[PDB]
Amino acid sequence: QITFSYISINEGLSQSTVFSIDQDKRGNMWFATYDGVNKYDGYAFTVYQHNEDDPNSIANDISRIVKTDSQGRVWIGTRDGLSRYDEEKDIFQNFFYEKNGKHLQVNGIEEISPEQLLISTPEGLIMFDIKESKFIDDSFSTAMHKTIASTLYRQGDQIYIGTSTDGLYTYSITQKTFEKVITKQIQAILQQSPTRIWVATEGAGLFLINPKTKEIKNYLHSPSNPKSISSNYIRSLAMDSQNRLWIGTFNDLNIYHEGTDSFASYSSNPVENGSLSQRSVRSIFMDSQGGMWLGTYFGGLNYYHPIRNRFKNIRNIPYKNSLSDNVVSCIVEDKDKNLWIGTNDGGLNLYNPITQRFTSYTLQGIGSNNIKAVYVDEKKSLVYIGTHAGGLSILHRNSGQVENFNQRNSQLVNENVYAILPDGEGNLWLGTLSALVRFNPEQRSFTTIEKEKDGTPVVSKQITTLFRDSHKRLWIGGEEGLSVFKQEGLDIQKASILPVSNVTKLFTNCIYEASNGIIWVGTREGFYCFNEKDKQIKRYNTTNGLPNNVVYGILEDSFGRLWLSTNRGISCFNPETEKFRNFTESDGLQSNQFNTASYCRTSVGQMYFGGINGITTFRPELLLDNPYTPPVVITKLQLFNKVVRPDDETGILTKNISETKSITLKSWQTAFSIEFVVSNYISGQHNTFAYKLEGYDKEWYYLTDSRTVSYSNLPQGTYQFLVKAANSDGKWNPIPTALEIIVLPIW
Amino acid sequence: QITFSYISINEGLSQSTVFSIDQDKRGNMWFATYDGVNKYDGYAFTVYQHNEDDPNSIANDISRIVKTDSQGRVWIGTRDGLSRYDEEKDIFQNFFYEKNGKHLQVNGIEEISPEQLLISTPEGLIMFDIKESKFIDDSFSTAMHKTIASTLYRQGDQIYIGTSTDGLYTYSITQKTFEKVIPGTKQIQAILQQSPTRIWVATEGAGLFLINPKTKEIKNYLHSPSNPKSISSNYIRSLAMDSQNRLWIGTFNDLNIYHEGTDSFASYSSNPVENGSLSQRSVRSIFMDSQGGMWLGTYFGGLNYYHPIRNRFKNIRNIPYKNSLSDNVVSCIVEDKDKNLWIGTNDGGLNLYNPITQRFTSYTLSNNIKAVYVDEKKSLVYIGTHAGGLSILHRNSGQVENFNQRNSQLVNENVYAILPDGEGNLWLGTLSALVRFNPEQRSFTTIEKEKDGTPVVSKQITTLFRDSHKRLWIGGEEGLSVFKQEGLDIQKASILPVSNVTKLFTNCIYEASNGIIWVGTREGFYCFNEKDKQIKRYNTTNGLPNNVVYGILEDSFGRLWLSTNRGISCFNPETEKFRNFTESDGLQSNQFNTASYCRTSVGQMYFGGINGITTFRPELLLDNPYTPPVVITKLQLFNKVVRPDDETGILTKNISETKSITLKSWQTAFSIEFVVSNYISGQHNTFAYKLEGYDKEWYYLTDSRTVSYSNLPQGTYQFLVKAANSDGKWNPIPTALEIIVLPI
């Protein structure tokens, strides 16, 4: 159930290789790449590169490791040494360790104490005393000092030290002992519990140690077994927020499953959307929200969060067993809990949701590939298929053979069958584009219905939809409107049970009878309910909160809420409060554009809605909203359209705007602008900002497409610029970020 | 040479089906969809939809035609009739035609005269009097009036009229003669005149017809399953000429472009695995904009967009299960003496591109190729890999020799560079040493000392280069050295002055045609003039887009082309002008790759990166010549949008049409949004603006399009704004809005 969004070169990442990931106290992500150190806030990258002129720039562009210490300070190991990010002045301090006239590279950083770091270089281990900004190389024992460490990892009073050739070691921070814990290079170390430490090796697979018993288990690759790890070359490990171990290999991501003692694989396939961007996973990190970030070598970052996977999409996968075409029409569940899915170009798909197996039925053979209706005759093991420009096909499910009926080999008046409903007497009603037709399977005959029982002509309208209500009445809908009929034997007879209303003439897409007996009709001009008790009708459209007036399908969840598909996503409607909660493509839907007849609710409550880009599925009742509402950070101040920097000529900032509580503007400093941001990775860039310059603005104002506000020629006084943010599920951070602005008088 | 950009739901298009495309005099594109009329200005969509509460809203969301007339007024045909976009009041007027109780649909619109439209409905042809705002159904001949038109196309005095069953008619506006042009039956979907002796007619099932109405003779092009150079389908929905006199043909299953001479059709198809292919099989509409940009509207895939200038850079990438580069992460590219390209990759092995057959073929072999050298005499390709040693591909047999630490004398199995020594052997640049490989003896000799006895320190080697004086240049992580060869011995040539560039991490070396040597590093690049022993350094502070310079090629004009981590730069060493290009201009990516550059002997350039190879001839590159005027799209006051004839009293006409506004004393805080509609450059434009009479100077914007002003002094001002295209060309005539700020 695991799919990824992508953050890489096109989104602003400096270079495609991410060696190491961490996060600071403001929620920014930090990415150590092979060309610059990247700071990322969910909207924009700040790339830190070396400049021979600026000694305050990062020492080298080749970064190897980023580490946040326990006080939220960000440290970088580069080719040239150790760098501290100065969040106050938004620059770097660079520190250098010379041995034999060369500056050593810093491959690792761990916290010995709050003001002491453990540093690893290619030529040994040393210490950085932070209070003094100095390297100390004589503090550890000879054996420890000389150790070439490939990875470093702290748990409590211990720091585990992986070597390249000499196995695993532990240093007690308190006791200062250095002892071998238990030949191939140790790439990553993780403690999951006090009875389980995980060790990832360069070619010897994944090890699990119990440091209490001192007993070990090794998991190696087996090609004969598809639930073993993907490779013995394992580079990174991280726990997620649901107690699952994520294993980054040279070839695939592996997630360890506790129950079976087995492994799930996840692979890079360029053609498969939401798959890993690249097969080789170099870095894995869990952010403060529980989002997982997987760094590859040539494919940037891949992001995952379970909340972002509450809507699951089923789509074509070229050259794999998958949905045959992404433009989907009807979806009908059979008695075996399989799904029969119509497509516009791909034929009929049979889908086993447990197995994930697809089968298709297509032309040359069902006689068209553009499917509009499906009815499953369960007694006779037949599937009846209605197509556009093709007619009626009968799939015999045992043999696989298909009977085709059209205008050239049968008495069927119109080959455009959009609806199929059994009539109750052993026959089927076909909704065609020019008539209602009875198909008798015993006689293989087609009969067009021209008269009612009383001889009232049925005017040749186009039938898009047929529906059978609990009272056994036939609802015939199309573009020309809606009409309801009673059946007297093989005749039909108008049932005058609707009032006189304009809703009878509306373009009609779908009809649905709710559990409480209410009938709901989807149209191009919103949707409406009809209660037969009082014959009252109430219509709802975009002015009532529906996101778009084209309603293709209506399904009902277990709370009696209606779920509606439209040209702008899916809406959840509560008929009792008459409130809407709307979702869009940015929330995970297949597209904003959904499609005709493309809706199904399984016997068990799973909901399926199809569109132009495949099918979205979810369980309405299990849906969760993003609970995270992080603070807004102010990211940029400008005076007269020039960026304002700490300690520059304006005299306005002595710190980065992000760390600033108050700015004072002199009389001539009259026009300025403020850029802000929120770092909510579950929501991405779909947050809503509210702002108000208290003392000037008369009310709050909203922003969704921009993150910048400009003011000009404010009168003298103190103002407080305030800004909050709502996540993509409309939940507000209730506590605003504030920046005081003192506008000085002339005198 | 044809690929598309996409404009659909994700970009703001209301619904995926575009029936009809047009453009107004402001440069906005218009699109009739199956749910809303759509106006698009290059940066944002305005969607116009039906509101039963607003009678100034469009009459129906189901729209079918959009037509801009001779005076730039936009008309819409919808399910409920004819609508006019009122550009002055930013609203719609809706008009209706009743027959037998139903309101009739408008399927076609055409201009008879500046105030008279030809309207086509399912039940016949009628006229719309623009002056009177009224339909006139009694002014055509019966024959014309009762005709069911499927398409309408004006050329000069004539309005051609395709029918559903009865062929192509022609109506003369002066004569008022309606007569059959040529005496199929299948419906005529589109008409198009290429010359006065060439009318093209698309049909629903009878294929494509070419008529010569002066000789009254026809030719029928049909679909042949055997011949792929025949027309792609017999169901043709849309026709349009581009600016290079080519006919574009929209069918049910593909785009076809007629090739005049060869009398045949190149097909372009929808392939989800292929970057830049048509978004969807069925092309329903085609329209050329005033720039020559071609817009293709599909049924389920929105719009596809093409302009030759947006294909000035060609991208060679892997296509699954079609013949192509086998892997997108590319390393070195090398031309051989038969003009083939050998292309190393990270995972996909060694690719051979044979520009004679235009085919790729690939060879498997640790897999990551860092160096390639071709010995034409013996038909061998020598391959150096990270981790895998030296391999030899024997071309005659397909057999591959491998030399590594287990089966050979090779010290270091990391071979990053290969170059002949001039004596029959190869130099190998490896991560620890310079090694000589002797193919006859299959021996590897580490070179650890000079003829002097002086140690050769050179380590972590990335690149070997032979200059025109036959000297060997050795570059790597630790720096750069130069050596003179004396038989089998090497000897240091102290020709470089005392400089920190000696110790730079070095990527490439190239000797320009004028003999100056150019070196690419990780701290920019530099040149070396040996005459003067002078070195000049350049980096980002001088205009270089990024400091990692992977490779340097030279065009016919002596300009250098540099590949980096942020695109490619054209650098003129005479003036020191950098001209930079990025992914947004069509490049494979901003990130290019090590060793991965090659200029063919005919002048073609190739640069490789993480997403394929970008190729182009500098000499045939063209810049965007179009610099449209900026249009002012939105005036806001206290963050509420002002509209024509509202409570504020500021605007009687759309802000787009307004030459002057007047602000009263309490109306003190307002903002101005603008746009430029330059479809070649997309959203990569630069705005310059100045409120003349208030602003200290001109200000520039590249990521926003709005300016705010507040508490301006009593007075009269001119807000001026102009725009530059992606390629830096400015419109010199700014757009002006007068603002009069009243006193208290």
Instruction: Provide DSSP, B62-90.
Output: -EEEEEE-TTS-EEEEETTEEEEEETTTT
A388 touches chain B (CB under 8 A): no
Query: Which 46-75 residues of chain B touch chain A by CB within 8 A?
Result: 49-53, 61-62
CB atoms within 10 A of CB A515: 8
Q: How many CA atoms lie within 13 A of A273 on its CB side?
A: 13
CATH label of the domain that carries residue A10: 2.130.10.10
B634 touches chain A (CB under 8 A): no
Instruction: Identify whether residues B633 and B600 lie together within a single domain.
Output: no
CB atoms within 10 A of CB B162: 23
The residues facing B241 across adjacent strands are: B247
Q: Which residues contact B227 (CB under 8 A, 6 or more apart)?
A: none
List Cα–Cα distances, A625 to A306, A310, A525, A620, A628, in angstroms: 11, 9, 30, 12, 9
In eight-state DSSP terms, residue A630 is: P
Cβ density class A330-355: b for 16+ within 10 Å, e for less: bbbbeeeebbbbbbbbbbbbbbeeee
In eight-state DSSP terms, residue A451 is: B
Best mutation target among A712, A716, A719 (most B Cβ atoms within 10 Å) is A712
Token couple for A625: 């909203």
Picking from A525, A593, A712, the nearest residue to B9 by CB comes out as A593
List Cα–Cα distances, A411 to A370, A392, A414, A616, in angstroms: 21, 12, 9, 38
> Length of chain B in residues, anyone?
744
Q: Do B479 and B504 form a contact (C-beta atoms < 8 A)?
A: yes
B53 interaction partners in chain A (CB closer than 8 Å): 543
Instruction: Identify whether residues A628 and A733 lie together within a single domain.
Output: yes
Token couple for A671: 């026009």
CB atoms within 10 A of CB A226: 10
CATH label of the domain that carries residue A642: 2.60.40.10
Interchain pair A567, B35: CB under 8 A: yes
- Return left, alpha or beta for B311; rule: phi > 0 is left, psi -120 to 50 is alpha, else beta: alpha
Residue A192 Cα, gap to closest chain B Cα (Å): 34
Q: In sequence order, which ranges of B348-502 are alpha helices (DSSP H)?
A: none
Q: Distance between CA A683 and CA A420 in Å, rounded? A: 42
Query: Among residues B601, B621, B641, which one ends one of the domains?
Result: B621
Residue B358 Cα, gap to closest chain A Cα (Å): 24
List Cα–Cα distances, A250 to A3, A199, A222, A282, in angstroms: 19, 15, 15, 8
Residue A708 Cα, gap to closest chain B Cα (Å): 9
Picking from B523, B699, B709, the nearest residue to A52 by CB comes out as B523
Instruction: Identify whether residues B285 and B298 lie together within a single domain.
Output: yes
Picking from A51, A612, A712, the nearest residue to B710 by CB comes out as A712
Q: Distance between CA A466 and CA B199 in Å, rounded? A: 46
Interchain pair B610, A548: CB under 8 A: no
B153 phi and psi angles, rounded to 5 deg: -145, 115
Q: Distance between CA A128 and CA A116 in Å, rounded? A: 6
Instruction: Identify whether residues A544 and A638 lie together within a single domain.
Output: no
Picking from A49, A567, A698, the nearest residue to B15 by CB comes out as A567
Instruction: Identify whether residues A193 and A79 lie together within a single domain.
Output: yes
- Name the residue of chain B whose CA is nearest to A318's CA: B273
A316 interaction partners in chain B (CB closer than 8 Å): 272
**Using what technique was this structure determined?**
X-ray
The residues facing B511 across adjacent strands are: B517
B9 interaction partners in chain A (CB closer than 8 Å): 585, 591-593, 612
Long-range contacts of A166-174 (CB under 8 A, 24+ apart): A168/A199, A169/A144, A171/A118, A171/A140, A171/A144, A173/A112, A173/A113
What residue has token string 């004969």? A224
CB atoms within 10 A of CB A746: 7
A455 touches chain B (CB under 8 A): no
Query: Among residues B281, B309, B337, which one ends one of the domains?
Result: B309
In eight-state DSSP terms, residue B145 is: H
A641 touches chain B (CB under 8 A): yes
DSSP A27-66: S-EEEEETTEEEEE-SS-EEEE---SS-TTS-S-S-EEEE
B273 interaction partners in chain A (CB closer than 8 Å): 270-271, 318-319
Q: How many CA atoms lie within 13 A of B668 on its CB side?
A: 16
Interchain pair B346, A298: CB under 8 A: yes
Nearest residue to B562 via CA among B543, B575, B534:
B543
Picking from A10, A298, A713, the nearest residue to B711 by CB comes out as A713
Q: Distance between CA A662 and CA A199 in Å, rounded? A: 49
**Strand A149-155 with A158-163, pairing:** antiparallel
What residue has token string 């070196």? B519
Q: Report how many domains make up chain A.
A: 3
Token couple for A276: 């890993």
Best mutation target among B565, B640, B703 (most A Cβ atoms within 10 Å) is B565
Q: Distance between CA A345 and CA B252 in Å, rounded? A: 12
Nearest residue to B351 via CA among B374, B333, B375, B378:
B333
Token couple for B449: 């000392």
Interchain pair A712, B707: CB under 8 A: no
What residue has token string 């640069």? B607
Picking from B272, B546, B704, the nearest residue to A318 by CB comes out as B272
A364 touches chain B (CB under 8 A): no
Q: Distance between CA A373 and CA A393 in Å, rounded? A: 10
Q: Distance between CA A366 and CA A349 in Å, rounded? A: 12
CB atoms within 10 A of CB B487: 9
Helix (H) or strand (E) holding B200: strand B198-203
Instruction: Identify whether residues A361 and A400 lie together within a single domain.
Output: yes
Q: Do B673 and B632 form a contact (C-beta atoms < 8 A)?
A: yes
Q: How many CA atoms lie within 13 A of B478 on its CB side?
A: 13
B638 touches chain A (CB under 8 A): yes
Sign, CA torsion B326/B330/B335/B336 = negative
A714 interaction partners in chain B (CB closer than 8 Å): 710-711
In eight-state DSSP terms, residue B638 is: T
Instruction: Identify whether residues B155 and B226 lie together within a single domain.
Output: yes
Residue B211 Cα, gap to closest chain A Cα (Å): 31
Q: Distance between CA A370 and CA A361 in Å, rounded? A: 11
Residue A168 Cα, gap to closest chain B Cα (Å): 26
Residue A612 Cα, gap to closest chain B Cα (Å): 6
The residues facing B78 across adjacent strands are: B63, B81
Instruction: Identify whether residues B591 and B639 lie together within a single domain.
Output: no
Cβ density class B5-44: b for 16+ within 10 Å, e for less: bebbbeeebbbbbbbbbbbbebbbbbbbbbbbbbbbbbbb
Instruction: Identify whether residues A164 and A152 lie together within a single domain.
Output: yes
Residue B439 Cα, gap to closest chain A Cα (Å): 33
Q: Do A162 and A202 form a contact (C-beta atoms < 8 A)?
A: no
**Strand B735-741 with B660-663, pairing:** parallel
Q: Do A63 and A104 form a contact (C-beta atoms < 8 A)?
A: no
A271 touches chain B (CB under 8 A): yes
Q: Distance between CA B639 and CA B648 in Å, rounded? A: 13
Residue A643 Cα, gap to closest chain B Cα (Å): 13
Q: In what order do the strands lie in the sheet with B5-7?
A: B5-7, B303-306, B294-298, B283-288
Q: Distance between CA A324 and CA B714 in Å, rounded? A: 67
Q: Distance between CA B649 and CA B635 in Å, rounded? A: 13
Helix (H) or strand (E) holding A664: strand A662-665
A-to-B residue pairs, Cβ atoms closer than 8 angstroms: 99
Instruction: Identify whether residues B612 and B652 lie together within a single domain.
Output: no
Q: Do B5 and B11 form a contact (C-beta atoms < 8 A)?
A: no
Interchain pair A344, B300: CB under 8 A: yes
Nearest residue to A389 via CA among B252, B22, B371:
B252
- Return left, alpha or beta for A497; rule: phi > 0 is left, psi -120 to 50 is alpha, else beta: alpha
Nearest residue to B720 via CA among B710, B729, B711, B707:
B707
A523 touches chain B (CB under 8 A): no
List Cα–Cα distances, A105 to A121, A124, A580, in angstroms: 6, 11, 57
Q: Which amino acid is at B458?
A: S
A710 touches chain B (CB under 8 A): yes
A635 interaction partners in chain B (CB closer than 8 Å): none
DSSP-derived 3-state class of residue B402: strand
A14 interaction partners in chain B (CB closer than 8 Å): 565
- Return left, alpha or beta for A337; rule: phi > 0 is left, psi -120 to 50 is alpha, else beta: left
List Cα–Cα distances, A312 to A340, A349, A434, A610, B301, in angstroms: 18, 18, 37, 12, 22
DSSP-derived 3-state class of residue B149: strand
In eight-state DSSP terms, residue B311 is: G
DSSP-derived 3-state class of residue A542: helix
Helix (H) or strand (E) holding B144: helix B142-145
- Name the residue of chain A whose CA is nearest to B347's CA: A279
A706 touches chain B (CB under 8 A): yes
Q: Distance between CA B589 and CA A300 in Å, rounded? A: 13
Instruction: Identify whether residues B115 and B11 lie together within a single domain.
Output: yes
Q: Which amino acid is at A446?
A: F
Q: Do A460 and A592 form a contact (C-beta atoms < 8 A)?
A: no
Long-range contacts of A225-233 (CB under 8 A, 24+ apart): A226/A265, A227/A260, A227/A262, A227/A263, A227/A264, A228/A262, A228/A263, A229/A205, A229/A254, A229/A263, A230/A254, A230/A263, A230/A265, A232/A201, A232/A203, A232/A204, A232/A205, A233/A202, A233/A203
**Strand A482-488 with A688-694, pairing:** unpaired
Query: Which 542-601 residues of chain A touch chain B by CB within 8 A?
Result: 542-543, 548-550, 567, 585, 591-593
Query: Among residues A278, A307, A336, which one ends one of the domains?
Result: A307
**Strand B18-23 with A708-712, pairing:** unpaired
Q: Distance between CA A322 and CA A615 in Å, rounded? A: 12
Interchain pair B300, A327: CB under 8 A: yes
Interchain pair B547, A10: CB under 8 A: no
Residues after which chain A has a gap (C–N > 2.5 Å):
182, 364
CB atoms within 10 A of CB A735: 10
Query: Which 143-182 residues of chain B touch chain A by CB within 8 A?
Result: none
Instruction: Identify whether residues B277 and B368 lie together within a single domain.
Output: no
Q: Distance between CA B34 and CA B57 in Å, rounded? A: 16
Q: In what order do the strands lie in the sheet with A36-40?
A: A18-23, A29-33, A36-40, A45-48
Picking from A16, A593, A641, the nearest residue to B610 by CB comes out as A16
Picking from B546, B639, B710, the nearest residue to A713 by CB comes out as B710
Q: Which residue range forms the structural domain that includes residue A344?
A: 308-623
Interchain pair A298, B583: CB under 8 A: no
Q: Do A132 and A93 form a contact (C-beta atoms < 8 A)?
A: no
Interchain pair A585, B10: CB under 8 A: yes
Q: Do B56 and B91 form a contact (C-beta atoms < 8 A)?
A: yes
Residue A716 Cα, gap to closest chain B Cα (Å): 13
DSSP-derived 3-state class of residue B501: helix
CB atoms within 10 A of CB A690: 17
Interchain pair B300, A612: CB under 8 A: yes
DSSP-derived 3-state class of residue B663: strand
Interchain pair B10, A698: CB under 8 A: no
Q: Distance between CA B152 and CA B120 in Å, rounded? A: 8
DSSP A130-185: TTTTEEE-SSS-HHHHT--EEEEEEETTEEEEEESSS-EEEEETTT--EEE---PP
Can you give A218-285 as a three-state secondary structure string? EECCCCCCCCCCCCCEEEEEEECCCCCEEEEECCCEEEEECCCCEEEEECECCCCCCCECCCCEEEEE
Token couple for A525: 């001009």
Furthest CA-CA distance within chain B: 107
- Return left, alpha or beta for B181; rule: phi > 0 is left, psi -120 to 50 is alpha, else beta: alpha
